[model samples]
Target chain A: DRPRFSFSIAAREGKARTGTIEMKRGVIRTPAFMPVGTAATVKALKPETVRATGADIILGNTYHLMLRPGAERIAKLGGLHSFMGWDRPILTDSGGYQVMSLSSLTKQSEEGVTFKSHSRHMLSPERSIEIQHLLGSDIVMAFDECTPYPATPSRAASSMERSMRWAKRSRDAFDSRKEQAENAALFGIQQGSVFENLRQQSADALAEIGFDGYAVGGLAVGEGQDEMFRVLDFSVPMLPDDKPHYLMGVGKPDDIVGAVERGIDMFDCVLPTRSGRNGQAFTWDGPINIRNARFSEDLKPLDSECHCAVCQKWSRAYIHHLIRAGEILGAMLMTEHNIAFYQQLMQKIRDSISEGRFSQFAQDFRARYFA
Target chain B: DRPRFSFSIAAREGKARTGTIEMKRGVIRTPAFMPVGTAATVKALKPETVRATGADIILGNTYHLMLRPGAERIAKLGGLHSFMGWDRPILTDSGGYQVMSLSSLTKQSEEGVTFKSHSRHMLSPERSIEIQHLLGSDIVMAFDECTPYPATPSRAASSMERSMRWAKRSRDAFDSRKEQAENAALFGIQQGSVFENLRQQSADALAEIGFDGYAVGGLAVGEGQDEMFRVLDFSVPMLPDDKPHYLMGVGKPDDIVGAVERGIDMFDCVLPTRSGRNGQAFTWDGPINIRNARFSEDLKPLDSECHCAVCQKWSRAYIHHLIRAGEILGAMLMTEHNIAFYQQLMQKIRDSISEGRFSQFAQDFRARYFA
Candidate 1:
């Protein structure tokens, strides 16, 4: 017998719901934001440091790990949880997204997407499931084409249909290993570009195949927030309401709040980490560019309202100096603070949803964060 | 009335002595190593992280601070201790060394050396003392020319004599601020370019002016270990035994042990932090480059023999991957571990001296660390 996975809604406020995601590793509070740990490690942070930022879960990429250390290597070293010293739940992305985005030469067909990694290795749907299993992902995403934006309705329909077929293959491959299937949960991805009918078809097909969860993919790829919200308006509700709904690579603080209001239970993105590395910090007052000349003598914290250790101990001027000097500690502090900010934001969203003030919270957040 | 500074030898074994320097901020146990916090930060680490490495004190550079976040600006914020969030004693170096090393278009005269900083600002001895006071340095260093390595005997003598005169001027300027002098302690630098007679003369002149402590400077600047040890053998004995004998910029694990054996008590260096950023880590087995291909699959801790937080949590393979990816956390972890290693070395040396087995400990440390 293996640990069972489950989710239960503890409170609901209109379309926003606060819940508990139960897993053997730990319980994740919803609506939750999983920090993106692209490689085994979060770029500038230690696993303990990331944990200290209040992140209940983090994400790893199948493409990067499979290319560098190799999934087999990680398995030999006691899986990613032990390898990275992060004992929390980890969700691994299917290599499909990166194959299309990062690989040099990629080709898609009925079988699966084949591409040359930097190491020139070929990846297929079955291989993606196997890699995720080897990396010991608690929640593994299904292989799906990340239908690019500006795609025609026909191209999007074809991509979504192909993804449904791949999702079936992904399901079969995942269930092929008894121990892996028992220990892990799989989530099928819905890709339809921006068409409601295509998303409905994809979701119905995935629900028929059955999965532990469903993910709204193909939204954050150069799609403006308004367009993404418009797609989510119809696409998110089409997924099975009983299972967790994750929005992959879905965006800024306001974007997350909007998705939560639209009934999204989970979210993961590289915005916080990537922006932090570039000396940008997300705050309640909106994002701040710490590298700007105007911040050179500003002695306030990065966010006056942020309670993270970075904001508690360092001034904007100090961080400004570190960034201008190209200091690594600057990147570490900024990344840590940004991740904490995202986690804090999610916590606030959860609190408001639980208290039935989610609509008011969302409205006020948008006004303040965007202003 | 102002707080008084004092030092006491707690134990002695041959020439190696374990002691304590008492200051208002804190009591520093010796033989202690002060990690260089250049620009008010121990690069890649927070003040708390540096403190956790068992560092009782950290060194700040007057040149770097005065150039960038100007000393006046730091004073406006709060003093260096509060500005950097380290409550422990801070030792600030005189700007003279960096003026010789980091500045360009330099000229030296009886008044003081004038050089074009990146900002093209001029610095003098009085200015140096004033900056240190403004930064609220717990221990201040007298400004002295760091003589060039290949200087002739006459050149070294002339530089030493000028430094002696500067030492007197520094004492006068420091005491001129009665409150600052009362709260802080100043150390006069003995710079004779490794010449024993000149070193004795420099020490005599400094003693005539009187300082809270005495520092043996200019020896670690490109002077090999053997020559440095030779200089310390004669130079250290010439300084007052009641005052702490600081070997300025003294280095590597073996170098520290040798200096301790030669009766030097305090030291500061950028070796641990600098080498860490370069992907190298110091261990009891000597330095290992984390970027080496051989470590890509080695799943053992960075140093199985070490007990630092980094070694206890991360494997060499993971750190190797991080370094290969140019991750900032790699530098942060490696620097932390190296600093811990150095602090541990110092603790062991102190323990051995207290137990009257310092000679044997020094012999064993040299063989093991240098082998």
Candidate 2:
């Protein structure tokens, strides 16, 4: 029999918890930071190298895959897992947000269609659910609109309500695919912008319909970390504690630590990779722009204190030279280190929570990180 | 005590010799194809992966290094080997060719300057020798002007004589670096436009210079394979039989096969890495452009017969998807496989020669490769 989805909390310190999410493919350590595989790759790094960075799972972008190489093509070939040469658990988005942002003639429809830009390429809740199924996605998100940032309260309220309606349809469609439903877990997203009342209302709706996991969405778009955390402080409490709370597209090391303390369990983002390609790198003492002249002959690793494979072998100077020359290997090495840094951060979080010293650990981490 | 450079041929069939060039870092098998690491890194590949492709030695571009990070900075930090994380014997080209082609205002001088593009960046024989020494190059190439293709006999004679004069200066410069010279091997390059007498003269001059190795230079620029082999047919016989015969920038699969048949013991080219970045892949059945529509959904590996780590795990359909999307990993995967393909070709060439069936093997390889 295929393994079913289950969230087991092993220990907790304040709102922070050390746990595991059991999927058919593997067990993902919670406070898990999923590296974004935007186009079925961790950008410059190989899947094995990505996994070597201590990632338990990686998020595949539904948008890019759907438009190119097509979900149908991947399914016909094998699935995203085998296709990308990764044998670990994969989480795919609803393909709703990209349709609105990237596609033309965008408009909403009442029948689970997140975009009306074109009928032929419409990504309805059913379409997204089927695509995720075809991709053999272990965690499939409900089709929901990305509530625009800096929206009027009136706009936020309507958007949240529509997302809840589509969430119900996503669940229904996923269930209709009985075989896929047995193996995959559905996650309903709460999209209320920063309005507490709307967030609570949206959370209640998703809780009523019921999903294996819940996500705090529409916060990290352009909001500063403080505002994002403030939303999570209220948003996370409304979601059921027994189920996982995934913070979608949620952020830097500090943001992740803050969210984990707010009881968020899962996260994914492109900051590590995108920043890497652009010559920025993360360290225990905040991010360092490798393109800086100071690192020209600095005979140190990206972070000398870090224990990643890249840092263990490569010097900051060499990486600096590579970046300064616009070399692809620079991006590869930088991304590899950044992902390891995040995974190590998660490991420490899990360790801190298990030992009931997460608050103290977080304080120390923040001091050094912000210094 | 360090290991000195030594060449020992294990077997020979006609002109093909199965041998090993022993160095302190590693043993590079004869007819070895050195992957180009033009800018310290091998474009998209990590050194270990490059090594995993069966490359015992790699070529580093002195021009790029001398220009970008500068030889002093690399020496100030460590050396190219540690800087780039490639702990194998590294072969460095004399900065001459790149200086002439890439630099502005190139002009030849009698006092060992291959290019006077800028007085500050003049790549003289002494300068190239010192730069390679600073990079801890195991196999150092003597600086010599790259004879322009389609040259008249009159032009070729002047170029060949000037190269011989600089070859003496390069020998003196390399030998002056006592510590570096003790651990390194210097190669004298033979340059003559396609004229047999000029080639014999150039070869005889380098032979008298008493280098650890000899390189057949100034071919594979724009000359067709037949023309290159035509030069090699008479050129190889002029060099010392005991020394390694490196064919500089000598080419595609068939070209390599033909060169190996004409007694070439070493090879280097940007074709594999360059072609990979452009979506071209080399299989035994010849090169396939992954961007082609025919490969859109092909489930085969880059080469079904390639036993590379990449081909072992990835499918052509997925690689096609990656290439089509212009993903960085596509270049990474493609480059990895192409390097592997060339290394495998060298492995086969070595195997056939050792078994005394090189002629028959070349015929069979050519038939399948071109068919």
Candidate 3:
């Protein structure tokens, strides 16, 4: 039988490589940026509109989907693909992270963690894997604990060890669901709280379990950019060279560029969608607040460099008015432009790496963007 | 050498007439239903999106525009057309009605009504005309009083008389502003509560003032459909047949059908937009609330007969979940479908009148809609 999932590199420049991940569902071009579709939507955008931004895939939250509209409700209706109306590939993270971060009250044990989302919701490794399978996740993340930042080295080692135990359960549970496992790719997560020794140990443990891919987790949550880069410098080299690598919950435009340079293949973030609702727009010359009074009567597109529908159809003056008036179109247009800009950023990264000019492209990008 | 505005009839069935009003800016099909574009936008829709619903022209509120964005600021920046990115003809209602109705503390005088919108903002006949002029209105409604519902006959007459006095002032103010008056067609308002003789008297006073059109104002505000239709029965014929007649804020699919049956050629209402924001959808088979639990698993479109993008692209179950979750997309899709529905409703009315089958069409329409 043919492989259910595979990743192959097309070009390489220094540590950075450009590649594509092919699953039965779709093809995702690397250094891909997955716009977060929390609560089953990319905020104000329609599914087709999100598709128009050149996205081959998007991220869904296991916690939000399970808590609201319910994974069972969505699967019973027809999986996340039909439920949300996106026919492209979808990477769903385990609810374990959200179950700890979002829920007000929680309890933890050797088996799993229990949180109060809809009244004592228990999320074990197997249960989390089951939810992802039910959601028809193409890239299923392993259920792992997110260790706290500014923690003891021993605490980091212990949590990293515990996450690997859950990783084993996640892999076993994923395989047991034959129908789901046969088509989907399971990714093991590495958690070490910025400790190099523990990260190495965590990577070793996940390699022994053997996942289809690997994700560097528990880094981008709050660690400053320098520290994150330091960790990725050592940690990324430890993962197998053949499999894909996704950097979880990362980041600003520059941060994403650096992550790509460090050999990460995928990323997901809420900054683009969330910043837009607050009147922010991402652009080639850097981000700007669309609510500023200077733009109120200045007739211009949000980004002259962008060719997205928002920039093509609306004016900066119009978007300014909308944002100032609290109009929904303001958020819609801003969010839309941000999404297209990020996708374009990823495209540029891939293009530069293919031409072996990624170093110059990175330098030139920051000069204009940061100026 | 040519006229700035002209209304010509093509067909009539009973009291209803089908015609077109040709102007320098655009042509408006008769018995037209204009979607309300309050505050320089049609709520959740883009200008092109609104235009795609077959809207030739839309109504802008002098009250809302003058307060927030400021008509002066708008004129300084091009005008409402470029500011809003809509290139079609626009009609602006005078701030006279909103000043009295919306503002908390109001002071009315022969000079004009002074209401607290942005703290002691005054709206006299000349000022209202100036504000509308700055907004570049293609069609301007005369500044007149909206008489309170259910009053003594003399109280109604006194208010009606005050309205005609304002009508004379409105005409002079419109003509006095030579730059603003030349291209824009002004419409005088007829207000006489539920009394026939007073309606004739109000109509006679407006005819003497010589306006491009006449509007039957005050009837549709709170009077039930029967009383409004009863008032329209006597009120519509009082206006000149050569001039187009508008029934201000008249409503619903059936209510409008009856109003057109009585010879009114123009209408504007918030029923479509506001109801949509609240999850109400207008359909050929009458209106349906999309938020009901019964529709949670209904995979069908909101209306099988409707061909709007919303109906074609989204399912009832999708809209149901959106509305249930208070997602902005839900309101957007619902409002979009409702606008298109209202526009389609007007098209059917015009088609029936042209074929001289309006009575049968109305009969059959209500049979399914009300059932």
Candidate 4:
């Protein structure tokens, strides 16, 4: 029997909806923002710290894990959840995106894109599925070709066609492990540059192949917000309504708000965590760089409107001093605040959608963020 | 009125004693180990995490704070306790050691040693005392020259005499501010470079001036454990028995154990924290380097016999991966475990002394640690 996974919409405001995805491990509330834990560990934070910020799910990458510790090693040591000590639901991305972007000596073919990993090992679609299975991921993504932006219509169509074929193979491989399949769910990817026709075709192909869920991939790769939103406006509506819709690697606060308005239920990004380490913080008044000279003696929290533990205890001056000194606690505190900010924003978004005030909420947030 | 600080022995076994030092801020149990928080922050850890390790007192460096953040700045920000978010009792060094070791263009005089700081500023005994006061130190150290090891008897005597004169100046400076002195206690340091007669003379001079506590200095500088123990044997008994005895920067778990056995009541060192950051951990069987290849697949906790939070939730394989990956969490977790180990050791020492089995406890610990 297949793993039991279900998504139910509790409320809707225009195209925005608040819902929950029930899984054997845990329940994830949506429209949810999953923090990216590129490695098994989420950068500088413990799993409990991440969970305390109200995050229901987190994303792990198959590429980095497969390269360093290797899938077989993790399986031998009990899967990713136990390895990282995070007992909540984890969604793993296919290795295709990172393998195409990070590895050298890359080549693409129908069998699956091959590249030299750090240890010079080649990874394919079937291998990606196997690795995710070994990781014991609750949500496994179907391996797909990540179509690059600025592609011509023909290039986009060809890429989308290839990804659909790989999606079928990923599903077949996932099903082959009957025991593992009974405890995990698989999601397929819809990849087409920014062309509406190609996106429609990709969506149709993914629907026929069928998956537990569907992701709108290849959108946040240097494409301006306007162009990306244009694709989501048409593309999101084309996918089946009953299954969850994930916007892979979809973005800044403004981007998430826009994507949620376009009916996306799940999203993942590295902006908050990465920017935090670099001294940038997301706040209700948009984002501020904490390392700036203006904060040296501010004597105020990172954000006055937010009440996270960092804000309650530390001042901007202390964080500024720490960052200047290149101290690890600086990164740890800033990242903690940023993750809390994102999770809190998601809660507000869900609340606004449930109250049927999402449009007004989006308008107010965009003005503040863009200001 | 001056702040009240008193020491009383509760129990004794052989040369080791269990006692308590009651100060205006809090009570510090004897045989206590203070984790060093250089620059007002313990590297890679939050103040709460450090406190959670059973540490009753933490040591802050006068040199680092006086240089970077500026003691005046910390004073304006409500002193070191508020600035660093640590509410426990704090002991600050005299800045003399780091000035002699880390600074340049140094010259010694009867008033004090003058050296060009990182920013080329000069620091004197009066300035050191003023900075410690500004930092709101609960236990203020008297400014004195840290005599170098392996000195001739003549050189050692001259250094010791000058240090005693500077100690008088430090006392005058500390007493000059009645308001600050009303909330803090001062401790004088004895430095004679391993000459027993000179050590006795220095201790006699400090006794004439009087202080709330006494510390034995200059023993841990390149002197072997046996030589250090020899100095402690003579120097510790020379000081007033009514005051706390601090052995400055002398350590390793074995060093601490031996110092306690020699009637030393307090100790502070950077070994546990610094070594932890470098992938070393203190264990019952001795220090183990977690980055070793043998730990790559070891699923056991850092120390199976230990009950630290890091041990309770994580394994050797996970910590090994973090250390190998150069992740900050690795340093944080390792440092946490090491601090807990030190504190637990101190607690065990105190317990054994109270129960009159300190000799047996020390023997068993040394055997396991040196095995």
CA lDDT of each prediction against the hidden true structure: 0.89, 0.89, 0.89, 0.89
Chain B TM-score (each prediction, in order): 0.98, 0.97, 0.98, 0.98
Per-residue C-alpha lDDT of model 3 across residues B1-371, encoded as one tens digit per residue: 43578899999999999989987778889889898988888988888889999898999999999987889989988889888878878999998778877898988888887778747788888889989999999898889998889867898899989989888888998898887687889999999899999999999999998999999999766779999999999999999999999987878888898899898999999999899989899888778898898888887889998989988867888788888888878878888899899888889989999999999998999899999
Q: What is the lDDT of residue A117 in candidate 3?
A: 78
What value of lDDT does candidate 3 attain over all alpha carbons? Answer: 0.89
**Backbone clash count for every predicted candidate, in the order shown:** 0, 1, 0, 0
- Which DockQ values do the candidates obtain, in the order shown? 0.71, 0.90, 0.63, 0.80
Candidate that scores best on DockQ: 2
First chain TM-score for all predictions: 0.98, 0.97, 0.98, 0.98
Q: Give the per-residue lDDT of model 4 (tens digit) for A263-327.
A: 99999989989899999988888789989989877888999888789999999989988988888
In candidate 2, chain A reaches a TM of: 0.97
Task: Give i-RMS (Å) per prediction.
Answer: 1.4, 0.8, 1.5, 0.8
Clashing pairs in 3: none
* Stretch of 10 with least lDDT, candidate 2 chain B: B112-121
For model 1, the docking class works out as medium
The runs of at least 3 residues in candidate 2 whose Cα sits more than 4 Å from the true structure, single-residue gaps closed, are: A112-120, B114-120
Q: Cα deviation of B336 in candidate 3 (Å)?
A: 0.8
Give the C-alpha miss distance for residue B102 in model 2, angstroms.
1.4
Residue A25 C-alpha lDDT in model 1: 87
For model 1, which pairs clash? Answer: none
